Scaffold this active site. Structure first.
Site, PDB file in Angstrom:
ATOM      1  CB  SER A 214      -0.963  -0.002   1.199  1.00 35.67           C
ATOM      2  OG  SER A 214      -1.810  -1.155   1.163  1.00 35.67           O
TER       3      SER A 214
ATOM      4  CD  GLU B 289       8.197  -4.465   6.013  1.00 38.12           C
ATOM      5  OE1 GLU B 289       8.427  -5.697   6.045  1.00 38.12           O
ATOM      6  OE2 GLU B 289       7.271  -3.972   5.326  1.00 38.12           O
TER       7      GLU B 289
ATOM      8  NE  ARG C  95      -1.235   0.543  -4.848  1.00 35.05           N
ATOM      9  CZ  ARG C  95      -0.380  -0.334  -5.349  1.00 35.05           C
ATOM     10  NH1 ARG C  95       0.223  -1.229  -4.570  1.00 35.05           N
ATOM     11  NH2 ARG C  95      -0.132  -0.325  -6.657  1.00 35.05           N
TER      12      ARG C  95
ATOM     13  CB  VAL D 250      11.333   2.047  -2.371  1.00 33.61           C
ATOM     14  CG1 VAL D 250      12.603   1.405  -1.818  1.00 33.61           C
ATOM     15  CG2 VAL D 250      10.952   3.315  -1.594  1.00 33.61           C
TER      16      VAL D 250
ATOM     17  CG  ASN E  30       7.353   5.467 -10.776  1.00 31.11           C
ATOM     18  OD1 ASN E  30       6.558   4.638 -11.211  1.00 31.11           O
ATOM     19  ND2 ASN E  30       8.356   5.145  -9.960  1.00 31.11           N
TER      20      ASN E  30
HETATM   21  N1  A3P Z   1       8.894   5.282  -6.160  1.00 27.55           N
HETATM   22  C1  A3P Z   1       7.669   4.754  -6.130  1.00 27.55           C
HETATM   23  N2  A3P Z   1       6.669   5.385  -6.789  1.00 27.55           N
HETATM   24  C2  A3P Z   1       5.443   4.857  -6.752  1.00 27.55           C
HETATM   25  N3  A3P Z   1       5.032   3.741  -6.143  1.00 27.55           N
HETATM   26  C3  A3P Z   1       6.042   3.140  -5.504  1.00 27.55           C
HETATM   27  C4  A3P Z   1       7.353   3.578  -5.434  1.00 27.55           C
HETATM   28  N4  A3P Z   1       8.123   2.716  -4.663  1.00 27.55           N
HETATM   29  C5  A3P Z   1       7.274   1.780  -4.312  1.00 27.55           C
HETATM   30  N5  A3P Z   1       5.984   2.010  -4.725  1.00 27.55           N
HETATM   31  C6  A3P Z   1       4.872   1.083  -4.636  1.00 27.55           C
HETATM   32  O1  A3P Z   1       4.739   0.617  -3.331  1.00 27.55           O
HETATM   33  C7  A3P Z   1       3.984  -0.610  -3.450  1.00 27.55           C
HETATM   34  C8  A3P Z   1       4.422  -1.510  -2.299  1.00 27.55           C
HETATM   35  O2  A3P Z   1       3.871  -0.976  -1.095  1.00 27.55           O
HETATM   36  P1  A3P Z   1       4.478  -1.582   0.295  1.00 27.55           P
HETATM   37  O3  A3P Z   1       5.849  -1.030   0.469  1.00 27.55           O
HETATM   38  O4  A3P Z   1       3.472  -1.084   1.418  1.00 27.55           O
HETATM   39  O5  A3P Z   1       4.564  -3.165   0.240  1.00 27.55           O
HETATM   40  C9  A3P Z   1       4.444  -1.242  -4.776  1.00 27.55           C
HETATM   41  O6  A3P Z   1       3.210  -1.342  -5.552  1.00 27.55           O
HETATM   42  P2  A3P Z   1       3.084  -2.478  -6.735  1.00 27.55           P
HETATM   43  O7  A3P Z   1       3.549  -3.894  -6.165  1.00 27.55           O
HETATM   44  O8  A3P Z   1       1.584  -2.518  -7.244  1.00 27.55           O
HETATM   45  O9  A3P Z   1       4.004  -2.099  -7.849  1.00 27.55           O
HETATM   46  C10 A3P Z   1       5.338  -0.166  -5.393  1.00 27.55           C
HETATM   47  O10 A3P Z   1       5.099  -0.017  -6.792  1.00 27.55           O
END
Ligand code: A3P
Ligand code: A3P
Ligand code: NA
Ligand code: NA
Ligand code: NA
Ligand code: NA
Ligand code: ZN
Ligand code: ZN
Ligand code: ZN
Ligand code: ZN
Lengths: 303, 303
Positions: free
Chosen positions: A24, A44, A128, A234, A239
C-alpha cells in the site's frame, strides 16, 4: 534518557509509526521520511509486530492472564516491558536521528495501544485501493499470513477486514495523532502530500522528501533491505507506473461483487464500481519521473 | 540507571537467576532468597522464558536471520532488546530490592546467553533426583511441554535431556557464576547450604533465609502465586516429607533401566541403583520442622 551516537530516546519522545496493509505504499512513505534530515525509519523490524501479537494473546487468554496477574506480571508490567523492548529495537536497528520512526505494516492494527505506550507518538496509516494492493500481492507472490494468493476474493476479503481494523484504530486515536495517507494522492501530488504530512507531524519542511532516490544507502538517508519485496520499486523516484495497473486483471465475478467483498473501498473514498477510477492531472514532477523510470534511466542494482 | 520506589536497576546489576527442571525445589530456593532482606525474586514471570525461546528461534532460522540482519536487527540489537525487556519484567513484577532475582525454571537452559547479557549475574541451578522430580510431575499432574505424564520412561528421558543441557550451560558459565544446588542437601542441611549459597553470591548472611515460612505475603518477604503448583508446599518450613517418597512407585522396567534412561543421575552424584539412596542425619532443625508439618501445625490457607 537512553543515548545514541548525541541523541536521547525514551517513551515520551515523538515517534512516528507508519503502517497499513502490505503493498500500500508503506515502504515509499517511510523512505520519503527517511530522506528528511531529522527522521530515521529504516527497514521493517519484523520482531515488533511479533512481540506485540504475543503480548496481546497473553491478556486475551483468561487462564494466562490470571496466571500473569497472580505472578505480578500485570498490564502495567507488560506495558513497561513492551515500551522498553520496542524502543531498543527502533533506536538501535538503524542510524540515530532526532525523530525515530518505525514501519512494520500491521503494527497499525495496534495504534491505540501504541499511542498509549508512547504518548507523543503519531501514526501514518497508508491507504491504497485494495484492488491495487491485492493485485500486487498476487502478481508478485507476496506471502502474507491469512492471504490465499490463489483467490482474489479471499485476498480482498482479508484486505477489507485488515483495513477496517486499522482505520477504526486510526479514528479512535483521533485526528491529532493519526493521519490516513492515500497512496494515490501521494504519487499524484507528492509535494502537496508531504507538506500536509510534515505539518501534521509538527516537523519543518525539507525538500529532501522529494529526493529520496538520491539518498538510497547513504548516511542520514534511506537504508533498504535487499530481501524486502518493495526494494526494487522504492529505489526509483515517485512515479505513476503502479497507480492503476490492476484494472482488467481481476476475475469478473469479483469485479461484480467488489462493493460487497470490500465495503471499505467506498468507506475510504474509493470508487469500487470504476475500472479503474479516473484520477486527475499528476504533477509535472511525477510525469517526468515516470517517463525516466519507464525508459530505463534507473538501472537494476547489481546487488 | 532506571529507578524504583530508591533502587536503581540496569544491565550491569548483580542479578540472581534460579532455575532447573520443574519439581526440583526451585520455588523453595527462591522463597528462601526472598526471605533475605537484600533480595527479591517473586513469582515465575512465565514471559521471560517465552521471549527468550522466540528470540533464539529467530537466529536459529537461516532465512529469518538473513532477513533480520538485512533489516539492521542484528544480534547486537536483539540482545539489547532482550536486556531491556527482561530487566523491566524482573524489576517491575515484584517489590524493589537491592538485589533482583528471577526464578523461571527453564531459563537455565540459556545461562550462557544470560550471563553475557547480564555480566554480573549469577546462577543457581537446582538439582533434584530425577526420580523424585518425575514422580512429582506424574502424581501431581503437573503439565510441562514435552513431558508425557502417562510414561515414567518418557518423563525421565526428558528430565535427563533437560538437566544435561542446563548442567552443561552451568559448567560453561563456570564456577564463579553458576552454582549447582542439590535439593536433597538443601532440605537435609539448610543452614550449611544457604551459607555456601550466599557466600557464592557475595551476599552477607541473614538468618531470615531459615525463616521463610514467617514471611509469606509480607512486605520484603515471600510473594506467592495462588495458581503455581508449589505454593502449598513452600508455605511450610524446610522439611523432609518430599525427600524420598518416589521409592517403590516407579514401574519395574524403568527401575531396571534407570541408569540407561537417566545417565545424568550418576553424572550429578545420585545413586541410580538404590531405591532409595540412603541419606545421612538431617539437621535437628529439619527433623522438628518435619514433625510439626506432618502433625498439621500449618493449616491449609482459606485462599
Ligand atoms: N517510487 C515509487 N513510486 C510509486 N510507487 C512506488 C514507489 N516505490 C514503491 N511504490 C509502490 O509501493 C507498493 C508496495 O507498497 P508496500 O511497500 O506497502 O509493500 C508497490 O506497488 P506495486 O507492487 O503494485 O508495484 C510499489 O510499486
Ligand atoms: N518447605 C519445603 N520443604 C521441602 N521441600 C519443599 C518445600 N517447599 C516445596 N518443596 C518441594 O519443592 C518441590 C517442587 O519444586 P519446584 O518448585 O521446582 O516445582 C515439591 O516436591 P514434591 O512435588 O515431590 O512434593 C515440594 O515438596
Ligand atoms: Na534521515
Ligand atoms: Na539493510
Ligand atoms: Na526480601
Ligand atoms: Na501473587
Ligand atoms: Zn534529487
Ligand atoms: Zn495485472
Ligand atoms: Zn521464624
Ligand atoms: Zn508415590
Amino acid at each position: 534518557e537512553l543515548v545514541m551516537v548525541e541523541y536521547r530516546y525514551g517513551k515520551a519522545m515523538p515517534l512516528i509509526f507508519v503502517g497499513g496493509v502490505p503493498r500500500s505504499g508503506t515502504t515509499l512513505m517511510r523512505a520519503m521520511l527517511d530522506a528528511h534530515p531529522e527522521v530515521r525509519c529504516g527497514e521493517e523490524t519484523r520482531i515488533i509486530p511479533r512481540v506485540l501479537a504475543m503480548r496481546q494473546a497473553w491478556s486475551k487468554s483468561g487462564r494466562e492472564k490470571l496466571r500473569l496477574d497472580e505472578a505480578g506480571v500485570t498490564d502495567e508490567v507488560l506495558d513497561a516491558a513492551m515500551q522498553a523492548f520496542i524502543l531498543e529495537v527502533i533506536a538501535k536497528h538503524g542510524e540515530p536521528a532526532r525523530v525515530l520512526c518505525n514501519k512494520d505494516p500491521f503494527t497499525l492494527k495496534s495504534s491505540v495501544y501504541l499511542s498509549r505506550l508512547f504518548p507523543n507518538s503519531k501514526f501514518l496509516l497508508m491507504v491504497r485501493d485494495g484492488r491495487a494492493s491485492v493485485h500486487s500481492m498476487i502478481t508478485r507472490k507476496v506471502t502474507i499470513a491469512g492471504f490465499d494468493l490463489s483467490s482474489y476474493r479471499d485476498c480482498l476479503t482479508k484486505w477489507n477486514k485488515a483495513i477496517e481494523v486499522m482505520y477504526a484504530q486510526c479514528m479512535e486515536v483521533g485526528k491529532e495523532k493519526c493521519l490516513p495517507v492515500y497512496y494515490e494522492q501521494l504519487v499524484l501530488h507528492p509535494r502537496r502530500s508531504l507538506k500536509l504530512i510534515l505539518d501534521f507531524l509538527g516537523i519543518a519542511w525539507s525538500d529532501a522528501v522529494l529526493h529520496h532516490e538520491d539518498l538510497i544507502g547513504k548516511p542520514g538517508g534511506v537504508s533498504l533491505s535487499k530481501i524486502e519485496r518493495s526494494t526494487d520499486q522504492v529505489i526509483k523516484p515517485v512515479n505513476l507506473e503502479a497507480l492503476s495497473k490492476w484494472t482488467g486483471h481481476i476475475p469478473g465475478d469479483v469485479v461484480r461483487d467488489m462493493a460487497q467483498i470490500a465495503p471499505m473501498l467506498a468507506q475510504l473514498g474509493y470508487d469500487p464500481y470504476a475500472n479503474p477510477p479516473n484520477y486527475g492531472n499528476p504533477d509535472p514532477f511525477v510525469i517526468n519521473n515516470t517517463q525516466r523510470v519507464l525508459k530505463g534511466d534507473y538501472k537494476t542494482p547489481a546487488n
